[PDB]
């Protein structure tokens, strides 16, 4: 019946958990969801593809990845149970009863937001997202505790595989949960910068990393701080670092796109491929290689799950794309017969190479989130095209109906009907084509009426002067409504989802900064196309008590810590006015008893 | 274990003998081995025992009579800090009365736990039908003499102080000031630096600095870096 | 500093034999750095003070829009170039229609007739197999090629919107 | 300086916050004495 | 005057409260408290940690 106040106190006094759940009493439970509840309809359909399947549920929510495999412990089969019912102080106490507090967190917050895009009502989302940003605190506030106690062992917390949920770490699980509260905080951007620079001193400056990478022998000076066989260490210890790799990845690419455009420009002739346009080909081909060696190692795990995590980065479908258009762009070009559509499938596809471009910006903060905004001020220009297209539709035709121009077919009219109408927004503005008033007036027609020449070449040898001042009348309304009304109608649109993402930009490029610093984690320290040499040694390499004890003790530790989290909020909490006025008000009527009794 | 520095804090178990389980091995007069997975068997948390041998064997409470001695020993004990003892009384049958009498005799502060029923229950409901009490947490107790027992208690109520779970270190505070008495400023400076330890800036202020405690700058100087640091 | 350094340069250039055209471009330079200090006069008033802060940091706003603008500008007029084929392609003709002309498109600046077939004339004007096109433009390229200059008309009509619009009021917010 | 510090404690000293803690403290004063006169 | 010391130790180690009360009860509080503000400011941009 929902009572959490009556859960905790029958708990505190003496009832063995442990002896008291039973796979009976467990099913009971989930029988208590509401019929018309989400929980209940996910229940039914599991069922139908008796036990309760909540596991069949768990593995449709979050993925096998992240799935718990329930039943798992009592507390965290309890605190499953709350999450899926949406019981949030419930929940809130089996997580503070239970262990593994950090990743249960933020697993519990993955679980709800993922629930939360399944519910028709509205404010049971709301409830839902509510609930998650809750634990996504609570988990914030835990690992920053732990952390300001001991950076070590709050590294190993972050980064070990927890059975509860499917052996992901939290990392992984704030990842998938979108918790960019979780990577912005402190400990895990200090381990990432960690992480991120390697062997080298996090501090080292920005130049004197250039400077080195661009003057190798500036490694073996004072230049650069690191944390013969020793030169060949401090070489590995330079060159393998993620940050060497990312700047040498992008002196990489951009030369990659430079010899694009020179044989796009200039040695792409219908003659066989010379030399350069066969460096551009091996070039291309390393680049597929090193996105099959990704998908194989999942951006163990079956196949087809690698792949599925692979392709769920949109950075690797444009990718795809890119190289997909390449392939095509290629064999066009080499069949006999279809040069010129090889040609221009190559301009396309030199664009979608240089727009993944964007991808380098996530290093820097300033250049991080405008790529977010950019991508939303796409869905707003997708949104505004609806009304452009209304209006264009609506004027188009009828300037179209009224000029009635004689040099009339289905590209002409099309031309004039949108394109013309759509360079005006831009200032585009041919009089001369639509105003008889700047033509000369002939007898260049047929009918009855009169006529006049336009001497635009796609404006229609002949047009009618029958209410011109009507077609004039349709330009002016159309540069209020077009070029004012509906252009900043956009423009408002994209001032909101700019301010949006300005809010929180920080935890957006801390999201983005992790997994960057992921990515070239376990990159091949060799750039295209010397990559295929770092490929060609992987494939060589492949064709030819203790732990549960530091596991304990780890758990201890972080209990410990969840415990004064818990003591000081609870000590909070009494302090506060309310809990003041309240106990005064108690001992008010024990003093107003004790004037009683007294009498 | 979720420590991170030095270890401070030492479990101390005081037995009798004859109760410990698999004592034979122990009889080597070294390192022994010990197969506690076999009266009752030694706690392995602990750091060091005390097996009081009472001469009857398997016989249960004749180590309060070391027990108190040891208690009042270290409470007179310097360091040249006074060390406090507390004692904390969790519950208890009708002998524990006698442990609390025999530890108010002897003064050592004493703590009830409030809501866990029996002679800690007993001792903290006449604190803040005495015989419809004294039956309703002794049913079988004789009650002239239980009485008679919770009176002499009551006698030095300054030695009595009562923990209810709506903190411990204000209570431990509390307790180890209402029993100190003494002025020279000598006595009260392991309460000032269990204060520092645990920040009982209110407790501090109150009770240790009164014009009747004549402190000078070399008593506090200690605790001026301590807080500091 | 530099005002006083590059008054100096010009000077110098200037009153040595063969370098007169060079100071005097030193010193065209040098009077816009000086121009520029009379903004410290304005410090004096209550209203025109903190907008110069205001101007310095929407300085460091046009620093970082660049990026955005010189990766779009790259994306879409290599690809417009290439489209095109011009035949009069030399590197700073590539650079002047591959990065200039576009800019300009920002600003109002459309050349249609340089870039839409159906405004040229048709002409053999190539020795290459395909249909060609006259465009009237100086720098324009003498002969251009009419195969999917739909796709080019296209790119400009995307362009239009990406820029003028997008990225524009990116940097306006 | 002084006397800056002295308006800062006396403005602290009356707020809603502090009277309460003060009732409250006197509430147990009068509970005390109410303990004591039985 | 040990007060300058203590008041430069707790800015250094970022000891608010003891900086605050070493602060009232030292002279020079004005130039003090500019130069607290100063050095505290200079630290600022020295740190890895946001918080
Ligand atoms: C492009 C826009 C900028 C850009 O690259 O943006 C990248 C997209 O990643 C790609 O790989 C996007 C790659 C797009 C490649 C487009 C190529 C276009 C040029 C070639 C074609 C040119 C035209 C050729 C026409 C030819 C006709 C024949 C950002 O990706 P992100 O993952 O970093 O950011 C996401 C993304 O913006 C999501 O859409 C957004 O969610 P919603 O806004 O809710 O959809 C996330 O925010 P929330 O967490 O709040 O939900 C963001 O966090
Ligand atoms: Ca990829
Ligand atoms: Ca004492």
Same mark, same amino acid.
């Given at each position: 019946?929902?009572?959490?106040?009556?859960?905790?106190?029958?708990?505190? !006094?003496?009832?063995?958990?442990?002896?008291?759940?039973?796979?009976?009493?467990?099913?009971?439970?989930?029988?208590?969801?509401?019929?018309?509840?989400?929980?209940?309809?996910?229940?039914?359909?599991?069922? !139908?593809?008796?036990?309760?399947?909540?596991?069949?549920?768990?593995?449709?929510?979050?993925?096998?990845?992240?799935?718990?495999?329930? $039943?798992?412990?009592?507390?965290?089969?309890?605190?499953?149970?709350?999450?899926?019912?949406?019981?949030?102080?419930?929940?809130?106490?089996?997580?503070?009863?239970?262990?593994?507090?950090?990743?249960?967190?933020?697993?519990?917050?993955?679980?709800?937001?993922?629930?939360?895009?399944?519910? $028709?009502?509205?404010?049971?989302?709301?409830?839902?997202?509510?609930?998650?940003?809750?634990?996504?605190?609570?988990?914030?506030?835990?690992?920053?505790?732990?952390?300001?106690?001991?950076?070590?062992?709050?590294?190993?917390?972050?980064?070990?595989?927890?059975?509860?949920?499917?052996?992901?770490?939290?990392?992984?699980?704030?990842?998938?949960?979108?918790?960019?509260?979780? %990577?912005?905080?402190?400990?895990?951007?200090?381990?990432?910068?960690?992480?991120?620079?390697?062997?080298?001193?996090?501090?080292? $400056?920005?130049?004197?990393?250039?400077?080195? %990478?661009?003057?190798?022998?500036?490694?073996?000076?004072?230049?650069?701080?690191?944390?013969?066989?020793?030169?060949?260490?401090?070489?590995?210890?330079?060159?393998?670092?993620?940050?060497?790799?990312?700047?040498?990845?992008?002196?990489?690419?951009?030369?990659?796109?430079?010899?694009?455009?020179?044989?796009?420009?200039?040695?792409?002739?219908?003659?066989?491929?010379?030399?350069?346009?066969?460096?551009?080909?091996?070039?291309?081909?390393?680049?597929?290689?090193?996105?099959?060696?990704?998908?194989?190692?999942?951006?163990?795990?079956?196949?087809?799950?690698?792949?599925?995590?692979?392709?769920?980065?949109?950075?690797?479908?444009?990718?795809?794309?890119?190289?997909?258009?390449?392939?095509?762009?290629?064999?066009?070009?080499?069949? $006999?017969?279809?040069?010129?559509?090889?040609?221009?499938?190559?301009?396309?596809?030199?664009?979608?190479?240089?727009?993944?471009?964007?991808?380098?910006?996530?290093?820097?903060?300033?250049?991080?989130?405008?790529?977010?905004?950019?991508?939303?001020?796409?869905?707003?220009?997708?949104?505004?095209?609806?009304?452009?297209?209304?209006?264009?539709?609506?004027?188009?035709?009828?300037?179209?109906?009224?000029?009635?121009?004689?040099?009339?077919? %289905?590209?002409?009219?099309?031309?004039?009907?949108?394109?013309?109408?759509?360079?005006?927004?831009?200032?585009?503005?041919?009089?001369?084509?639509?105003?008889?008033?700047?033509?000369?007036?002939?007898?260049?027609?047929?009918?009855?009426?009169?006529?006049?020449?336009?001497?635009?070449?796609?404006?229609?040898?002949?047009?009618?002067?029958?209410?011109?001042?009507?077609?004039?009348?349709?330009?002016?309304?159309?540069?209020?409504?077009?070029?004012?009304?509906?252009?900043?109608?956009?423009?408002?649109?994209?001032?909101?989802?700019?301010?949006?993402?300005?809010?929180?930009?920080?935890?957006?490029?801390?999201?983005?900064?992790?997994?960057?610093?992921?990515?070239? !984690?376990?990159?091949?320290?060799?750039?295209?196309?010397?990559?295929?040499?770092?490929?060609?040694?992987?494939?060589?390499?492949?064709?030819?008590?203790?732990?549960?004890?530091?596991?304990?003790?780890?758990?201890?530790?972080?209990?410990?810590?969840?415990?004064?989290?818990?003591?000081?909020?609870?000590?909070?909490?009494?302090?506060?006015?309310?809990?003041?006025?309240?106990?005064?008000?108690?001992?008010?009527?024990?003093?107003?008893?004790?004037?009683? !009794?007294?009498? | 274990? /979720?420590?991170?520095?030095?270890?401070?804090?030492?479990? &101390?178990?005081?037995? =009798?003998?004859?109760?410990?389980?698999?004592?034979?091995?122990?009889?080597?007069? #070294?390192? /022994?081995?010990?197969?506690?997975?076999?009266? #009752? =068997?030694?706690?392995?948390?602990?750091?060091?025992? #005390?097996?009081?041998?009472?001469?009857?064997?398997?016989?249960?409470?004749?180590?309060?009579?070391?027990?108190?001695?040891?208690?009042?020993?270290?409470?007179?004990?310097?360091?040249?800090?006074?060390? =406090?003892?507390?004692?904390?009384?969790?519950?208890?049958?009708?002998?524990?009365?006698?442990?609390?009498?025999?530890? *108010?005799?002897?003064?050592? =502060?004493?703590?009830?736990?409030?809501?866990?029923?029996?002679?800690?229950?007993?001792?903290?409901? *006449?604190?803040?039908?005495?015989?419809?009490?004294?039956?309703?947490?002794?049913?079988?107790?004789?009650?002239?003499?239980?009485?008679?027992?919770?009176?002499?208690? &009551?006698?030095?109520?300054?030695?009595? *102080?009562?923990?209810?779970?709506?903190?411990?270190? *204000?209570?431990?505070?509390?307790?180890?000031?209402? /029993?100190?008495?003494?002025?020279?400023?000598? /006595?009260?400076?392991?309460?000032?630096?269990?204060?520092?330890?645990?920040?009982?800036?209110?407790?501090?202020?109150?009770?240790?600095?009164?014009?009747?405690?004549?402190?000078?700058? #070399?008593?506090?100087?200690?605790?001026?870096?301590?807080?500091?640091?």
């Amino acid at each position: 019946n929902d009572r959490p106040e009556f859960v905790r106190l029958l708990i505190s !006094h003496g009832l063995s958990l442990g002896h008291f759940l039973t796979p009976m009493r467990l099913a009971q439970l989930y029988s208590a969801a509401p019929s018309n509840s989400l929980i209940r309809n996910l229940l039914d359909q599991a069922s !139908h593809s008796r036990p309760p399947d909540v596991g069949h549920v768990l593995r449709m929510l979050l993925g096998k990845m992240c799935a718990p495999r329930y $039943p798992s412990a009592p507390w965290s089969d309890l605190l499953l149970w709350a999450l899926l019912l949406n019981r949030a102080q419930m929940a809130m106490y089996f997580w503070e009863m239970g262990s593994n507090a950090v990743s249960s967190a933020l697993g519990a917050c993955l679980l709800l937001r993922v629930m939360a895009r399944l519910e $028709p009502d509205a404010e049971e989302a709301a409830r839902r997202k509510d609930l998650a940003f809750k634990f996504e605190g609570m988990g914030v506030d835990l690992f920053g505790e732990c952390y300001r106690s001991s950076e070590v062992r709050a590294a190993r917390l972050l980064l070990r595989r927890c059975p509860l949920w499917g052996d992901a770490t939290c990392l992984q699980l704030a990842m998938q949960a979108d918790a960019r509260a979780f %990577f912005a905080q402190d400990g895990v951007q200090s381990l990432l910068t960690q992480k991120w620079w390697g062997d080298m001193a996090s501090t080292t $400056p920005i130049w004197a990393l250039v400077l080195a %990478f661009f003057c190798p022998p500036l490694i073996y000076t004072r230049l650069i701080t690191f944390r013969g066989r020793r030169c060949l260490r401090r070489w590995f210890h330079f060159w393998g670092a993620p940050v060497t790799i990312f700047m040498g990845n992008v002196v990489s690419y951009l030369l990659f796109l430079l010899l694009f455009s020179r044989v796009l420009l200039v040695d792409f002739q219908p003659a066989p491929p010379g030399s350069l346009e066969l460096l551009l080909y091996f070039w291309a081909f390393t680049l597929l290689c090193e996105e099959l060696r990704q998908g194989l190692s999942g951006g163990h795990a079956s196949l087809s799950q690698r792949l599925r995590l692979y392709l769920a980065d949109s950075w690797n479908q444009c990718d795809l794309v890119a190289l997909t258009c390449f392939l095509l762009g290629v064999g066009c070009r080499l069949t $006999p017969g279809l040069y010129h559509l090889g040609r221009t499938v190559l301009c396309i596809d030199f664009m979608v190479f240089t727009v993944r471009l964007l991808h380098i910006f996530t290093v820097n903060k300033q250049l991080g989130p405008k790529i977010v905004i950019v991508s939303k001020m796409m869905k707003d220009v997708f949104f505004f095209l609806f009304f452009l297209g209304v209006w264009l539709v609506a004027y188009g035709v009828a300037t179209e109906g009224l000029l009635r121009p004689r040099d009339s077919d %289905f590209p002409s009219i099309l031309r004039r009907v949108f394109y013309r109408p759509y360079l005006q927004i831009f200032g585009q503005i041919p009089q001369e084509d639509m105003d008889v008033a700047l033509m000369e007036h002939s007898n260049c027609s047929s009918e009855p009426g009169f006529w006049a020449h336009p001497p635009g070449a796609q404006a229609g040898t002949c047009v009618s002067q029958y209410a011109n001042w009507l077609v004039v009348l349709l330009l002016v309304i159309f540069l209020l409504v077009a070029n004012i009304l509906l252009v900043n109608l956009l423009i408002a649109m994209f001032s909101y989802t700019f301010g949006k993402v300005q809010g929180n930009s920080d935890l957006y490029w801390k999201a983005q900064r992790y997994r960057l610093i992921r990515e070239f !984690h376990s990159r091949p320290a060799l750039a295209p196309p010397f990559i295929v040499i770092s490929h060609l040694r992987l494939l060589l390499r492949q064709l030819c008590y203790l732990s549960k004890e530091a596991e304990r003790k780890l758990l201890t530790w972080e209990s410990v810590h969840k415990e004064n989290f818990l003591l000081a909020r609870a000590r909070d909490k009494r302090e506060s006015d309310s809990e003041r006025l309240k106990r005064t008000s108690q001992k008010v009527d024990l003093a107003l008893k004790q004037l009683g !009794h007294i009498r | 274990m /979720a420590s991170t520095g030095g270890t401070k804090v030492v479990a &101390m178990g005081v037995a =009798p003998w004859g109760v410990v389980r698999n004592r034979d091995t122990l009889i080597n007069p #070294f390192p /022994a081995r010990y197969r506690w997975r076999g009266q #009752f =068997p030694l706690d392995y948390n602990y750091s060091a025992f #005390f097996l009081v041998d009472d001469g009857t064997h398997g016989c249960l409470g004749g180590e309060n009579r070391f027990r108190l001695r040891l208690e009042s020993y270290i409470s007179q004990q310097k360091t040249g800090i006074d060390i =406090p003892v507390l004692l904390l009384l969790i519950d208890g049958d009708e002998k524990m009365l006698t442990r609390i009498e025999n530890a *108010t005799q002897a003064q050592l =502060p004493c703590l009830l736990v409030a809501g866990s029923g029996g002679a800690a229950d007993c001792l903290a409901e *006449t604190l803040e039908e005495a015989r419809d009490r004294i039956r309703r947490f002794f049913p079988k107790g004789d009650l002239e003499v239980l009485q008679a027992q919770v009176e002499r208690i &009551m006698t030095r109520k300054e030695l009595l *102080t009562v923990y209810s779970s709506e903190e411990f270190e *204000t209570i431990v505070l509390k307790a180890l000031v209402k /029993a100190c008495g003494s002025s020279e400023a000598s /006595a009260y400076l392991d309460e000032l630096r269990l204060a520092v330890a645990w920040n009982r800036v209110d407790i501090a202020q109150s009770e240790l600095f009164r014009g009747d405690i004549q402190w000078r700058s #070399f008593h506090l100087e200690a605790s001026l870096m301590d807080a500091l640091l």
